Amino acid sequence: CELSEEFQIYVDEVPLPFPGHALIAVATSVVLGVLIFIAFVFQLRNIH
């Protein structure tokens, strides 16, 4: 006779896939970049 069994497993709370990590990394990087560049533009324009 066939000896078979079935069962179920529920998993959750996946952190994030790759695009979420990529997006948050590039978002922080460009936020720092635009802040430092706004400081650059403000300083160099106020010197002028």
Partner 1 sequence: IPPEDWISGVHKDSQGFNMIKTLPINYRPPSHMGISIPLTDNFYHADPSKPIPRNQFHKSKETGKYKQCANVTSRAMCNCSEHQKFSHAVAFSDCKEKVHRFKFPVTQYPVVLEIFNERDKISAEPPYLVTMTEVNMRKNWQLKHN
Partner 2 sequence: DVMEKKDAWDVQEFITQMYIKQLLRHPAFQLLLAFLLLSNAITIALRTNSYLGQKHYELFSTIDDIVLTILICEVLLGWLNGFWIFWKDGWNILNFAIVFILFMGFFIKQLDMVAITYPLRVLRLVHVCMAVEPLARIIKVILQSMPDLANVMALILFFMLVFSVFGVTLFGAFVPKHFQNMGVALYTLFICITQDGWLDIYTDFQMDEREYAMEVGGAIYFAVFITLGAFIGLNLFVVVVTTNLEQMMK
Partner 3 sequence: MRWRDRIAVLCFPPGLMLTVAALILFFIHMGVFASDVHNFCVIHNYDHMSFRYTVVLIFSQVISIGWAAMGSLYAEMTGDKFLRCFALTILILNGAMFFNRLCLEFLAINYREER
CA distance 10 to 38: 49
Q: Binding of partner 3 at residue 29 (CB under 8 A)?
A: yes
Could you count the other beta carbons within 10 Å of the beta carbon of residue 21? 11
Residues 6 to 25 in contact with partner 3, rule: CB under 8 A: 14, 16-20, 22-23
From residue 11 to residue 40, the character string flagging contacts with partner 2 as x (rule: CB under 8 A) and all else as - is: ----xx----xx-xxx-xx--xx--x--xx
Ranges within 3-42 binding partner 1 (CB under 8 A): 3, 5-15
How far apart, in Å, do the first and last CA atoms of the chain sit?
A: 91
Residues that bind partner 1 (CB under 8 A): 3, 5-15
